[PDB]
Symmetry: D2
Subunit: 214 residues, 4 copies
């Protein structure tokens, strides 16, 4: 499945219809995926993960920085299931930071800003949690590093998957939303480190990208 | 504003993409407004209410049974604002229950199944909290009833407003979502008492319509 | 089980440690039961209910006005279980109002301000949801009324149970907290209709009792 | 403010009163600080942070892995204030991983696994978010590292502060709870990587210590 498909027509929502930080209004064009919707979709994704890896101990690997919010929420929903059902996915949490984007584009060079503690993943079931699959370079690179160590199994959950001509074609195991070729921010996703402190996933305005341009 | 407008050519979301009670699986067609989206819009509605009435003491009147969820959540968001800024809108709460629907049509006979404690509304600023304005008979009836007690002011917040030829033309002061002419259920809104125990506002299938038909 | 037992020697927390509505600042003495603690306890109560009535269709009956918050939250947790497991407690909802308190004491006279439609309880499994059992007059009156309609089974859930000499000794099927003989407000529990718009269950100050005295 | 002071003989709660992960049923002794209580305290902490640094651009620095849950939640509450008031603390978010514990013991040798990014802190207002101050060694080392790059200002928010003779005597700027000399787990706080996937802060059972010992 492709997840919740947001066609290139979806108009999104007027900023005035929700609560958005005033210091960002100037720089945002529309609310694209409201936080509450992300939550509802993530609750389902958590049940999907539980069905797929339920009877196993897992190592949840958070791809910093962009995946931090999705990582926290996805694990909370899995935790909810773990304490309210017969099913139980015991979890250990790991973090790794990869960097390669400047402005609204990938530089093509993915760097591991530390956390290559991937050697401990040998024989383990790994659940990688990322914010968005764009060109697919980051995940392609991450998967290469992880597989190096022979983990028992590796699954990838990405909140978003972008429909772009630049995509390598990589598809995650779990996907919240499939979106158009627009640079989105919010929910931990940034534009040169800004907009991470934003509840909803929005689209940056032209004046916004210009103002925060590197 | 007319709120968040959901167009006629909008097919909602696949039930498959969310978590819905299995005991309702075949009874629903699609998810129309995810719970989280309702919360996000309700958060903004609370700020708008406080902006308009936040300067005074308010009496929140809940229109049972359908408005119970929206009433609870809207008040919670208003309380969140109250305890996180000097901006305070003291609130007292009241409930009145009106009945007139059978299956998916209004009998045209709006019965007050308990609710004349309305005398306590005299001289007060009233915020009526309702689930949906359809033909408008209910709210028209309620407004007439409340006006009999001379409140200081009366404002109405309805989570939904349906675009239907059957409407009287009434428009609330606050509106969450403007929807197509479809009988929705969930979020305390029912179909012959069922579907109230449902997080998301959904469209009732034909099998559900028959299964729970009065 | 007696629920979470709070001893007579427990004073609660300084108002300074939490966020509380500014308009009630001087009217409250201490935070007695943090909202989040109520939520955590309610979550287990929802699992307990599911374990006792899960195999059946239930009619949740809300005792207005004080039980409205506990009713909304308990049902929300029950719903959460319902959409994340084959275990499904399908439920319909009803509301009933019982008035008898003036200031911080019962007036003896218990008026059932709306409740002829309890006939819908006939032959069904009922879950009564109430805020607090004090003298026991209210619940006693309610149980008698409901029995008149011959329901299949009745179970009561009370957020609080007060340790007081005035109590008749009634014990609910589910209890959140067993508290000392103090007049608490907040979480929908009032003092002459005030303090319902309060997240935490708190103890009133003498100034609050005096200022809102009736 | 010294935060919520938890007494030496604090009993905590029977696990049977809350919902805990099945895989930890025999590994915990008591629920020490309920998740909901942590949330309530964190809400106030966010308002306190906003009161002290609300008029400026702040860099929130998460001390991994322990402070990941507190960091997410504290920032979420700050964001809630940011999108609902005139005051806005635009935040950028950074992470730094420090490691020094084995079982329930501090090796005294702190390792900086990833965070050199600290050069970007020059002339910025830094809010360090940590899980707990025990011996004080970790925060001591961190402030030294951060201060090396001349930040405009640095404040420390620690969810917990342990009363221990081993303590150096460091006092954070914001403190959630001051606890007795016990090795707590949960809410991202681990015991050899275990117990992070647990919502409540609990005390470890004797069987848990032996099963998860390093
Ligand atoms: N805010 C915001 N970040 C990204 C990214 C960042 N780049 C990475 C994915 O890149 P790629 O697939 O191109 O290798 C992710 O880790 C993500 O954080 C890609 N597309 C967007 C986008 O549209 N918006
Ligand atoms: N579940 C579900 N309830 C209603 C109602 C109920 N009828 C009332 C509004 O009716 P009207 O405007 O026609 O008088 C509301 O109180 C609402 O509870 C109208 N339309 C719908 C609908 O599409 N779905
Ligand atoms: N706010 C606040 N309400 C009540 C009540 C109200 N009275 C009813 C119970 O009364 P009784 O058992 O005494 O007959 C409940 O419906 C409850 O709402 C009792 N004690 C308190 C209290 O300490 N505080
Ligand atoms: N789970 C759990 N972790 C810690 C720690 C970890 N050690 C660090 C603080 O140690 P110190 O002050 O001794 O240097 C923190 O980063 C914290 O994660 C100290 N005490 C406890 C405790 O009681 N429980
Ligand atoms: Mg990234
Ligand atoms: Mg980025
Ligand atoms: Mg109605
Ligand atoms: Mg109805
Ligand atoms: Mg009552
Ligand atoms: Mg009362
Ligand atoms: Mg640590
Ligand atoms: Mg640790």
């Amino acid at each position: 499945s492709p997840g919740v498909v947001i066609s290139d027509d979806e108009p999104g929502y007027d900023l005035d219809l929700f609560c958005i930080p005033n210091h960002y209004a100037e720089d945002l064009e529309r609310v694209f995926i409201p936080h509450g919707l992300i939550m509802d979709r993530t609750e389902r994704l958590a049940r999907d993960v539980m069905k797929e890896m339920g009877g196993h101990h897992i190592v949840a690997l958070c791809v910093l920085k962009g995946g931090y919010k999705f990582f926290a929420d996805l694990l909370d929903y899995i935790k909810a299931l773990n304490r309210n059902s017969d099913r139980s996915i015991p979890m250990t949490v790991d973090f790794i930071r990869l960097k390669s984007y400047c402005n609204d584009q990938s530089t093509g060079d993915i760097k591991v800003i530390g956390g290559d503690d991937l050697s401990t993943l040998t024989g383990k079931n790994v659940l990688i949690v990322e914010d968005i699959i764009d060109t697919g370079k980051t995940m392609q690179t991450l998967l290469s590093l992880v597989r190096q160590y022979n983990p028992k199994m590796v699954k990838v959950a990405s909140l978003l998957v972008k429909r772009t001509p630049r995509s390598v074609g990589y598809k995650p195991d779990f996907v919240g939303f499939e979106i158009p070729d627009k640079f989105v921010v919010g929910y931990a996703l940034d534009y040169n480190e800004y907009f991470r402190d934003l509840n909803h996933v929005c689209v940056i305005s032209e004046t916004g990208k210009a103002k925060y341009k590197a």
